[PDB]
Symmetry: D2
Subunit: 472 residues, 4 copies
């Protein structure tokens, strides 16, 4: 005998699965009672979340709006078309000159589909080296030659690097490498590079070597939409992005591509037009993905409408101002930030001058409800014990924090890193020994208490703190 | 100035985005008001949907539980661990013999990561030919040599086929092809095959040619969990699946892999153990994916608890009984089913004795709120059949007599497609003139909506929905 | 102090290197005093050898005639042009319909260059399975997936097979495999296949699946030139060959390719022309090879003039007649030949009915100065021996002499069975019967007495250092 | 009727094929009546030529000595084993530490077989860029990214370059590129590099990036045998070579490889041994080649015996001395030589300062019986009209010429380039116009006559001038 639909199918999570419900409620409290500084995290809206958790998950809709493989897509088509049009609008793109595919499941899927669309297996790519600030999917292999990302397996990667002393992209060495290596695709955009990008120079280099130029704006896409950092669309053939970082949406990816007439170029025929659209669509489906996740597409449509608002531009301005204010506070104490500041939403903090690795700082911070991530910095070699920590402003800025509040975050981070150093000095640099200092540490308890009191002062998007199971 | 958190961040969707809210409400109505027969669709529970739409979407958690690239994962780790443990439980697997990765974003990502874990670029794969019922990701290139799936771009695929007169997998031709082509990986399981799989024979073939054996149980995973079809875990090295078809969960993928001591094989050393776990995990992350989608993982844990219940076992049995009853009704009308029946959740209807392409029947049905999909059949492009599935309408509480009624609605829809064809010709341009102001289409559509609208609907409250008519 | 030019540079080999000179003289004796049945071997002419051993070896001439990367090629260009023109003439080809590159160093270089010209890495190829009679370069991997031939490493191969009942190519199975696997290139021609090829059916299959069709005629090129077997040029896009087997020339390779208007095809524009020439030339050089071996090209031009003569046509006819007569003799002794006969220069002897592996028969024959080679047979340690007529036919042997060869082979196999019955099947045990065996000694002596009678091309027996 | 064996098979070339005989005789006269300066050419001995044109061509001998597929190899095995042993002896190698495969048909086959033995498809290699002096088979693709050599198709190439100002290998940039690109194999040795190689530094770079190190000594192999240039065997894992250049043998290749215990290295197990022999043999056969060319192997055995003589060491010294004397003469005329001199058998002459392309100089020289080749130089782009010409000493040194004779060669070249300039000044630089100036040019005729009178003063190896058909 089947359970009635009402029993298995309409009963709330809190009754169906108390264990999972409790864990979500614990996670909700964690998110609003600590200081969340992972640069790739944000707190999305309740409206996005209501779309994400909806009947849209039930629909198979392989293909393109209007050109589907299944029937029943009358409304899914309108949702996807709205998502696509709102994506172009959010980035101030003319639909005659740009198209967008909104089906990628996430950022790594989006990049792999973009590469599959324009590259054959083993074709050459150049992206920013991971330890210089680029992403895994920009062709990451280690200095020891170990291929880590599939983008260094299925494609041939030659990363370009920042200058080892200034931390800024070395555009001269980029050009020299591109002319020697002759990549089919040059990738710009990054995960931990704290400066803006000279897309014009990237276009000059790509033209000199005959490469396509792709910007992966995942981290800063919200700043791009708000016209608060350089726009990659002016110069790049393809722009990929996630939607869950500074864009403040669901977890999804998007691939933007040029359409229409190509700009004049020597040797190029008259009336030549871009030919990315069909290849990009085909790479996403049927080549790589299956059914779109329509609940993510619907949720993304909501986020893109929210991103196009006056309030969102103010948010993006505030994100940048908070990151700068945090950076100045840390540098005043003598902490080493890569490039000595930031022009975006994050700072990259080199802990090697302190004799610390990023895992120790991440671990101690976590016990204080300060959420960061350890992060590779130039020249290090251990991913799980790297030389740095990365700090981002988007998530707490979404809770309404301003510059003075980010200065308090700076002080909390100074306390945490100081305490990390004191524990290492007393208990040892070996992780096994360092860990003994994390037990019954009154200063950790004091800092945790201060962090939670501070965090409780701010509102929180995505759910009602007043109705959460675990209150103060 | 920034908008207050409450305004942009706590206001309900209906107010923030009326355009999208309305479209979701129209889609909710559409799901209520049709006969949903796409064999890969289902209607998941409100409990799954509540976990899917939750603050779990905010978290970066790359890595594995207890070994992450980011802080703050104390609760995300517990959710993922519980998801993995419930996945092993739902499939009756011993955790010393099997592990599972629950991070794949969907089914196609799960498969591509499983392949990446065990194969180098250009290594050889064999899977069921798409026109024989296999999936795109099993190495689909057309009969024209057009590489369609990334599986055939980054790897070298050669499909195996069903017997061209019985519709069943031709195991002898599978063996002969495998011994000639020497694949590193043989894939079994499919998207439109209406029978069970002889995994024991697949294992004999894999052992004879030296291949790994992977089953993609995406379509029948719910039936596997309920022990209503053959278990691929008895014989396969790796089992992939989606979680949203017959398993009735969110859209996600899982990769199961053997762990522990290997069975005796000549030439293989003693005390040898499986070495899939680290390669599978690495392929998912950092090789292919980035951050896990924790709201999917949380929602999946919910679906896996639901799948291990006696009610779900009864559901799986009913899915099978409904598929048989529908196939029997259609065959009682003289229609042709591939293999003459079914052993699972679907039927593959051969429209060849009728003169209709799948797209004709599929498009007519869509106008009547009957959602099927055109489907290639063995030896076809231009599909000669339609695929019909029982999971979704079974989840709405339908039983055998209701599926016999679905049979009659389909019999009416194909009869209409024929009458249109006889009146307007077989050429699609000419045929499309029958779908215009056709009172019989309108009459069938009304009968369908009136039949469909009465049934219960999981996932949301019909009493709260914006469009009740 | 530098040696005077005459001392190091003009003194004969016999004085400069007595060690190597003596070994060459011993090898000349060996070629005279045995029955050479390796189907890929021949005895070329002294005229070819004089061109091969000449100052043409000194020249760098990368490029094509009239378009070289080095100066000084006024005469090398005329030699290569003459070689190419004689290659087209020897195979009765219209120079407006066919071109040829004569630079490949040997047969395997010729094939790999042909593949490189028309395929990208990992593109799909089908060729005759090695155990069905195909060549290594047509693709070969092991049951364990070990890729043996470079063709299977750099491209993706799938073999087609002969029918297990008839031993002939199974054309329906070839077609089915090609439609499933969708190769970019189908190779025909082989190394141990004793029948002719239905190139028309290969062309039908290639058209059905959209593949290019290449024939590797290395083994039967001499018979093709003499118009004694089917011409692959009627149906194939590209024809590769060696020049040292039945063509009786130096060791070299040639790649023939279509030129000019393409024949009508659906979905193909009007006035379409072939575009193989530049790709083929580029693949040979600069992609794969360096400087041509002009002594080989000159010697090849000689061999191609010799191949176009009525004497060579008679030779090709005699090769076929000798192989038939030998196959008939062996088959009258009750032995089993793959396909039950031959239509070319070789027979493929199935030893499985006798309980012998090809390696046993080959090793015993070698001890008797009978040179054959163990050879895989369909459905297999190789279970057969391949025996060829070109080399002994070049020494003037006719059918009755090949019947005598058949009796020497019959004696060799009887002895091989008698050794097996006495010492056992294991080659460790079997090898004990080869020590101080007077019956091997007697067969070896009878073989030498038989062989040393006949004439020998390429050198004067009257001048050779070892006459006993 | 079959022709008697004597008619078709024993009759001399002069009777069987008068056209080819006549062409060989014209080529023989050309070789001994001009000045032959192609750096990759030599004049081999009559003894080598007698082995090359011999019954050895008739034998199929697939496999390795002892481990053959066919029978009948009693003597071919002794010839091949003698060739291999003499090869090791010629390069002063201990058979316990070095093995050699002598079956490669030429240099390009030898290199591709070495690569196939140790690399999988698409593995990375780094060789000297063609315009810097490396060979096609060292991974040549053009500055425009066009893949030319199959070594850039089947493998992934990133060339290293000479310093743009000095013309010497930039070892610092080699190391930097190798650490970024992470090649599996680094190739040293070259075709037009006029200096010796710092194999020690190459070993240091290879060890730093975990690459194998291969030297292709084709051009200088004869100088290596005579210990007149640095020995690559001291530091390289594998050494490939042709045998027809400075080694003065037939056209063939060899692959030398290390055997036995590996030198100590951190992270390398105890008792570890080299594993090249089987892979290299297998790559040559059955993977790549078919039947060995036993007449080449026999001829090579002769050449290797000759290369181990005291006379050959004096020859190698004279080759270097003649190249230096020629270079001094040309530079004393103000001509531009890459690196301003030579340490081997060649000079590389940059004609761009004169406003000349190398095809013009090559073409005019050819009309004067002066055989050179146009040669790419650093920074040019056209292959059939490049910026330099390459001049080598081996071939005329084999005819007995010494330094004073090579100064006369420099004078002829000075006359030839001067005359090339005059024709360009009169007729212009476009090739169709410049070619008009080569008709009825009295100074060309006079220079050609002088070259021929000079060339006729010297002996000639490989054939008896007294016996040749076309006499003075
Ligand atoms: N500049 C940059 N920072 C970033 C990312 C990035 O892609 N680029 N990330 C994007 O998400 C996170 C780091 N993700 C990483 C994942 C794997 C490895 C890696 O090298 N793993 C090796 C080593 C493992 C070990 O030492 O234990 C491996 O998996 O074998 C590094 C970073 C966060 N910070
Ligand atoms: N430094 C160096 N000098 C050398 C060689 C070498 O490999 N390296 N060679 C070794 O043998 C010869 C030159 N071989 C070459 C062959 C092709 C191309 C080349 O770039 N071919 C292009 C462009 C042809 C064209 O412009 O017409 C092509 O074939 O498409 C360059 C050099 C002689 N001198
Ligand atoms: C056997 C099989 N495997 C994998 C997938 C892929 O799942 P995603 O769409 O989540 O990538 C499917 C989807 N098949 C959908 C259908 O048959 O209609 C499938 O049928
Ligand atoms: C620049 C960039 N591009 C793509 C991605 C991939 O997004 P997914 O995780 O959804 O695959 C990231 C993730 N970066 C995560 C981080 O920097 O912490 C990224 O930083
Ligand atoms: C360094 C080097 N290596 C290999 C080869 C190839 O040899 P083969 O031509 O026999 O394939 C050459 C030829 N170089 C000829 C020249 O420099 O003019 C070479 O210079
Ligand atoms: C059909 C075929 N093609 C190419 C080759 C290669 O020729 P080279 O050895 O010159 O590379 C052979 C050699 N076959 C030798 C034999 O059958 O005994 C061959 O049989």
């Amino acid at each position: 005998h089947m359970d009635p639909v009402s029993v298995w199918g309409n009963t709330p999570l809190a009754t169906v699965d108390p264990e999972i419900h409790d864990l979500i409620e614990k996670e909700k409290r964690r998110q609003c009672r600590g200081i969340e500084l992972i640069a790739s995290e944000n707190f999305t809206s309740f409206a996005v979340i209501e779309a994400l958790g909806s009947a849209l998950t039930n629909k198979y809709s392989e293909g393109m709006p209007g050109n589907r493989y299944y029937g029943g897509n009358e409304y899914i088509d309108q949702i996807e078309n709205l998502c696509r049009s709102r994506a172009l609008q959010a980035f101030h793109l003319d639909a005659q000159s740009w198209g967008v595919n909104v089906q990628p499941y996430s950022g790594s899927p989006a990049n792999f589909a973009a590469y599959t669309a324009v590259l054959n297996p083993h074709d050459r790519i150049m992206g920013l080296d991971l330890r210089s600030g680029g992403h895994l999917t920009h062709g990451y292999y280690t200095s020891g030659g170990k291929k880590i990302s599939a983008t260094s397996i299925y494609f041939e990667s030659l990363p370009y690097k920042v200058n080892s002393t200034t931390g800024y992209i070395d555009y001269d060495r980029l050009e020299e490498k591109a002319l020697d290596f002759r990549p089919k695709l040059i990738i710009c955009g990054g995960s931990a590079y704290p400066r803006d990008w000279d897309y014009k120079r990237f276009r000059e280099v790509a033209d000199k070597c005959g490469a396509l130029l792709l910007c992966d704006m995942a981290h800063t896409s919200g700043l791009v939409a708000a016209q608060e950092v350089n726009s990659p669309f002016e110069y790049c053939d393809i722009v990929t992005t996630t939607t869950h970082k500074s864009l403040r949406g669901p977890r999804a990816g998007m691939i933007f591509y040029r359409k229409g007439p190509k700009p004049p170029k020597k040797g190029q025929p008259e009336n030549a037009v871009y030919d990315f659209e069909d290849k990009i669509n085909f790479a996403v489906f049927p080549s790589l993905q299956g059914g779109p996740h329509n609940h993510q597409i619907g949720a993304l449509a909501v986020a893109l409408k929210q991103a196009a608002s006056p309030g969102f531009k103010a948010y993006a301005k505030q994100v940048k101002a908070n990151a700068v204010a945090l950076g100045k506070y840390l540098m005043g104490k003598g902490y080493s930030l890569v490039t000595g500041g930031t022009e975006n939403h994050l700072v990259l903090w080199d802990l090697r001058p302190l004799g610390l690795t990023g895992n120790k700082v991440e671990k101690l911070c976590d016990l204080c409800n300060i959420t960061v991530n350890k992060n590779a910095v130039f020249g290090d070699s251990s991913a799980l014990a790297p030389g740095g920590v990365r700090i981002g402003a988007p998530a707490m800025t979404s809770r309404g924090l301003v510059e003075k509040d980010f200065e308090q975050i700076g002080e909390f981070l100074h306390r945490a890193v100081t305490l990390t150093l004191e524990i290492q000095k007393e208990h040892g640099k070996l992780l096994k020994d360092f860990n003994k200092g994390l037990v019954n540490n009154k200063a950790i308890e004091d800092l945790k208490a201060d962090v939670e009191k501070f965090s409780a002062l701010f509102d929180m998007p995505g759910f009602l703190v007043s109705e959460m199971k675990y209150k103060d």
